[PDB]
Structure formats: structure tokens, C-alpha cells
Amino acid sequence: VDPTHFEKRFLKRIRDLGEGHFGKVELCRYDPEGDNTGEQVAVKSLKPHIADLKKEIEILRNLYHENIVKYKGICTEGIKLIMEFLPSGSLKEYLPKNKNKINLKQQLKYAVQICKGMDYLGSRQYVHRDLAARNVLVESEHQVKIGDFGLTKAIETDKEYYTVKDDRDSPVFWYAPECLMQSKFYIASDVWSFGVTLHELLTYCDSDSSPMALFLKMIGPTHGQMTVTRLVNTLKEGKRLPCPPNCPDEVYQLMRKCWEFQPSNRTSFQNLIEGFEALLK
Amino acid sequence: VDPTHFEKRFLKRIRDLGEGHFGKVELCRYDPEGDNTGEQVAVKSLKPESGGNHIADLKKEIEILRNLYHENIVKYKGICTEGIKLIMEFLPSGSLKEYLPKNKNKINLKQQLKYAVQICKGMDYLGSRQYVHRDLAARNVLVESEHQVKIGDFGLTKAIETDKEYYTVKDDRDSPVFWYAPECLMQSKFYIASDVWSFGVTLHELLTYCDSDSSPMALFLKMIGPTHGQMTVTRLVNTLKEGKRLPCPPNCPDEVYQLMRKCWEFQPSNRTSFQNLIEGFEALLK
Ligand SMILES: N#CCC1(n2cc(C(N)=O)c(NC(=O)C3CC3)n2)CCN(Cc2ccc(-c3ccccc3)cc2)CC1
Ligand SMILES: N#CCC1(n2cc(C(N)=O)c(NC(=O)C3CC3)n2)CCN(Cc2ccc(-c3ccccc3)cc2)CC1
């Protein structure tokens, strides 16, 4: 018996966790005894892209880090990705609900854990390209995990970036200017996304101070097909998301190093881990 | 009786000639005698659910056109007030987009260069009055006769301040991006030199008889290509940064393509002027 082979006939749908417009992530129970005692799993599948999900499956199968969601296996009819279920969900769901329990010290420990997870990915020559609070899962009050790798791409040995072709669904309010301007994705681009994610974590993912809400207030909400060129212009003039309420200036200064215009001038994940650990002493 | 005062009760709507986001231009007959012998007129008006600044902007447009007098600018006729309406002459041939595909056999290169000259004279008259047009495209160039064109819409026209070189725009979501200079796409800044860049695109349209399969939009989307209703403009900017331009129209001589390329220098200060373009076409027509 292969423990990473899930039979379709025992994978019972409970409900949806998430949707792109090419597929979904569902809560199922793997229940081979038919009595509802089976483990709950998160199951990624396509609407009725296949090559892309097969590559994503193969990336996650071979990642093993305490701050990366666990691969559990596949269901093959078409193919489904079986992952551990984290019932606390993303930081976007968990933080608004748990402000009273989650103080600054705990936010800096989640930041360190996100940086460790990201630096392990970068070490395997991957660029994530979708690092946001909605993709960071809460394992417990004390631990988070990167929970989705839908846009993760390999960087070829002795290249520095991956160039993207399908960009129409880009999370632009999280993207470094080289991604907006030239569709180029470097590890330094994930560091820029991490700065935005840290901004979300420090605002407890409140929807009224999201990266999108705050950038739209800055550039104007009614520019349609010009939205992205105004955002790049704004970033060109030096403007950045403001210091979160209650956020100490030396945390804000580590965030700002994620957002130097030029990839080569941004902080490393290792430098961020050291900065946060210094603040935690 | 003011001949520029059109009474609503005599303005009979016939059909739509054009539609934007906030208003339309309609073919009407102004028929005071009630017997269908009145003149046909083109009528610009706002949609009911109009919006914030649209009335102010149409009233500015009306004052702009009222005081333009040039043989290659559509003629103001008057207004209708009740929800103000701009009354213009009606040109039954329509725009180059309607006319050129139907009339390839009679419109040869010499006639195309004369139309280019007449567009540049109209544009240089508008520039002379400190206006930037910001919408110069074949769909806004009307055909008076086989021998004459007129610039027939001023919906985006603005005054450049005395001792400024550009106008900065804020309402941009409906921009004709495949006609826009990089400084318009990147900074929403509009110079007379920006209208020169649009003129070069409009020349390309004229030289392709406005065929839809070689439109500026079709040719740029095949270059960049059809990516997202959110990243399209930043790919287009990148394409232009790298030096890519619309190719030479089939049958277009290189000496005409070279006048068109002087329109499309990346830096506004490096682009040809309208008076230079007129000179170059006139040299070719000799
Ligand atoms: N991490 C995280 C958040 C997502 N996620 C994963 C888990 C987990 N493993 O437990 C989870 N948990 C919860 O929501 C619990 C109820 C509170 N949410 C995973 C991504 N998904 C969005 C998504 C992204 C990509 C696709 C997709 C699939 C195939 C092809 C193309 C795109 C589909 C959905 C949102 C939920
Ligand atoms: N020139 C030219 C082509 C337009 N146009 C003007 C005329 C004319 N005077 O004869 C014309 N003629 C024809 O089409 C004949 C039948 C073949 N077309 C005018 C502009 N319009 C587009 C447009 C532009 C702006 C607005 C607008 C109105 C109010 C508020 C905001 C925007 C509405 C429509 C397209 C047709």
C-alpha cells in the first residue's frame, strides 16, 4: 500500500476552502472505513493547467520544513494534491479573530517563521511569486506555515530571475517594481512581497488597511487599465505603505529594506531573521 | 432669432453615430417646419445617469469648438439647452474608419498624403491655440469629400497653461492607450509632442485604410500580446522602451515610414513637429 495514494472513492467533500478561476482547494475527509473517523485533508484540484498542477505537486512533495504546509499525497483518476488541513486557516482569517491573544512579540515570531520558510524555498532555487497573508497558514498560536505554491517557479542555475508569461491575475499590490515593469521574478521580488505580508501581519490583516486599500487611496481607485502604471509611478517617486498603527520604528525600518526600488539593494531573508531575533531578545 | 439656438421641440433624433462611457453623438434632423426638409446635424449629449464633472467638461468642450475656425476642424452650429447639447455639422461620409475601407480604389497614396497634410494643419492650428487634443485617431477624422478631412471630436481636448508645456490628466481609465506616447502611459502627462505621437499612429491607420486586422490595437496586442486587462499597458510601455514600433504599412514607401517614425521618438523633445511633417509631405507631393 502506498500511504501517499488517496483513492477517489474514500475522499468525501466537506466544503470549499478557496477558489482560483482554474480550480479550488476543498476540505475533505479521507474516510476509507466509511464511519467519519478519517483524517481531514486539504485537496487542490482543477475545474473540468494540468501540467502546472503536476509541477506544483512535485515542488511541494520535495519541500520539508516546519514552516511549509505538509504534502500528504495525490489522488489520480486528472490529478488532485492532498495536503494537511490547518483548521485555523490563513493569517487573513485568524488575525482579525485573535488580536487579543497575538501581541507584537508573537507577530515578530510569525515573521521569523515566514522568513525561514521562504529562505528554505530560495535555497532550493525557487521563487514563490504569491507571498501574502492569505497564503500563510496558522498551525497553532505559536506556529505558521506557507500554505500554497500555485505560482512557485524554479530559477535556472546561474540565472537570477524567472520571466513570467501569464500575468493577468497578478497580485500587483504585493509585487516589486521589476515584476510590474518587466515581468521579472527574483528571490528579491519575494523579499519585497514579504515586506507587504509583514505590513498585513502588523495590521492584523484588517481589510480597511490592506495593501490594495492603501495603495488605491494613494494612487486613486478609478484608473481601470492604468492602475498598474500609476502604482509603478508611485513606487518610482519613493512612496511606500505607511508604518502600521502601533508598529515600532525599528520594525518599520526592516520592512522598508524589503522595498528598496532595486532588487540588489533589498535585504536578504537571512538579514530579516537576524533583525527580528535582535528585536525579540 | 439666434441661428446658433436649436429648440429641443424641433431636434428630431434619427440614430446613434457614436457612444462613450458618459454620452453619445446622435444624428438628428433640425426640422422647424415639421415636413422633413430641415438640415441633418450631429448632436453631442450626456447620458442621463451623467456624473460628477461631465456637464462642466462638455460645457468646456462646447466653448472650445465654438471658437475654433479652420477648414480641417468640424464646424460648430450651436447648442440646445434643457442637459446642454452640442450641435455640429453632419458629415455623411463619416470617419476615415468608415470611409477608407469602402474607397481604397479611389484613395491612392497622393490622396492619403493630402489627408495627412490636412490633419497636420488642423492639429497645428489647435497647438497654435494652446490645446492638446489627446484623442487623435482615424475614428475622429471625418471625411468632408474625397478631397477634404476634418478633425471631428474634441471630447478630451484641454488647454495647456501659459508657460507650461503639458497638461497632467487624472480621469484616464478610458484612455486610447494604443495611440498614446510613453509620457502619457507612464506619467499621464500630455504635450503637443504627445499629439504628434498620436498623429503618427493615425497616419499608420490612414496608410492601412483603417483595416481592423492591422489596427494599432490588433498590431500591438500581437506584439505584446493579448495578456491582461490589468498588465497590458505596462507590457506596452516595456515594448516601446525596447524600441519596438508599428511596422511599415504594406505598399508604404520608406520615405513616408521615416516621417511616421519621427513621430515615435521615445523623448517628446526628439519628435518632429506638425509644421515639419507638413513640409515633408509637401516635398513628397511635388
Ligand atoms: N495557504 C492557503 C490558503 C488556502 N488554504 C489551505 C488550507 C489548509 N491546508 O488547511 C486552508 N485552510 C483553511 O482555510 C481553514 C478553514 C480555515 N486554506 C489554500 C489556497 N486557497 C486558494 C487557492 C489557490 C489556488 C488554487 C488553484 C488550484 C488549482 C489550479 C489553480 C489554482 C485554488 C485555490 C485558499 C485556501
Ligand atoms: N469625429 C468623429 C466621429 C463621430 N462622428 C461625428 C460625425 C459627424 N459630425 O458627422 C460622424 N459621422 C458619421 O459617423 C457619419 C454617418 C457616417 N461621426 C463623433 C464622435 N463619436 C464618438 C464619441 C465621442 C465622445 C462622446 C462623448 C459625448 C459626451 C460626453 C462624453 C463623450 C460620444 C461619442 C463617434 C462618431
Q: Are B259 and B272 in contact (CB under 8 A)?
A: yes
Instruction: Provide the number of CB pairs (under 8 Å) joining chain A to chain B.
Output: 57
B18 is in an annotated binding site: yes
Q: How far is CA B207 from CA B200, B204, B258, in A?
A: 11, 5, 13
Q: Is A97 in the pocket of ligand 1 (CB under 6 A)?
A: no
**DSSP per position, A215-279:** HHHHH-S--GGGHHHHHHHHHHTT--PPPPTT--HHHHHHHHGGG-SSGGGSPPHHHHHHHHHHH
State if residue B140 touches ligand 2 by the CB under 6 angstroms criterion.
yes
Give the Cα separation of A117 and B272 in Å (integer): 55
Cα A235 to averaged position of ligand 1 atoms, centre (Å): 30
Cell of B184: 502619457
| Closest ligand 1 atom, residue A19 Cα | 34
Instruction: Give the residue carrying C-alpha cell 499597458.
Output: B233
Grouping H, G, I as helix, E, B as strand and the rest as coil, residue B151 is: strand
Burial of B261 (C-beta count, 10 Å sphere; 0-12/13-18/19+): middle
Q: How far apart are CA A73 and CA B114, in angstroms?
A: 71
- Resolution number, Å: 1.9
CA Rg value for chain B: 19
Ligand number, closest to the Cα atom of A138? 1
A234 in contact with chain B, both atoms CB, cutoff 8 A: no
Contact A10, A37 (CB under 8 A): no
How far, in Å, is the centroid of ligand 2 from the Cα of B42?
A: 8
Q: Catalogue the long-range contacts made by B39-42 (C-beta closer than 8 Å, 24 or more residues apart).
A: B39/B90, B40/B14, B40/B90, B40/B92, B41/B6, B41/B11, B41/B77, B41/B87, B41/B88, B41/B89, B41/B90, B42/B17, B42/B74, B42/B87, B42/B88, B42/B89, B42/B90, B42/B91, B42/B152
What is the SS3 assignment for A17?
A: strand
Q: What are phi and psi of A144, to 5 degrees?
A: -120, 165
What is the full DSSP assignment across A156-187?
A: PTT--EEE-S--TT--GGG--HHHHHH-EEEH
Residue in A180, A183, A223 nearest the CB of B173: A223
Q: Could you tell me which chain B residue has the CA closest to the CA of A237? A: B187
Please give the Cα distance from B68 to B58 (Å, whole number). Answer: 15
Q: Which method was used?
A: X-ray
Peptide bond into B52 cis (omega under 30): no
Flag whether residue A182 sits within 8 Å of chain B, measured between CB atoms.
yes
Are residues A126 and A206 in contact, defined by beta-carbon separation less than 8 angstroms? no
Nearest-5° angle of CA A178, CA A185, CA A243?
60
* Dist CA A128 CA B22 (whole Å): 42
Residue nearest to atom 33 of ligand 1 (CA): A24
Domains of chain A as residue ranges with CATH: 1-85 (3.30.200.20), 86-281 (1.10.510.10)
Report DSSP state, residue B93.
T
Ligand with the closest atom to the CA of B15: 2
Contact B230 A225 (CB under 8 A): yes
| Beta strand ranges found along chain B (DSSP E) | 11-19, 23-30, 39-46, 76-80, 85-89, 131-132, 141-145, 148-151, 158-159, 166-168, 189-191
- Cell, residue A231: 502604482
Residue A162: other Cβ atoms inside 10 A: 19
Q: Is A24 annotated as a binding residue?
A: yes
B90 CA → ligand 2 middle, Å: 10
Write out the H or E segment, with its range, that includes residue A19: strand A11-19
Helices (H), A36-165: 50-61, 91-97, 104-123
Q: Which amino acid is at A246?
A: N
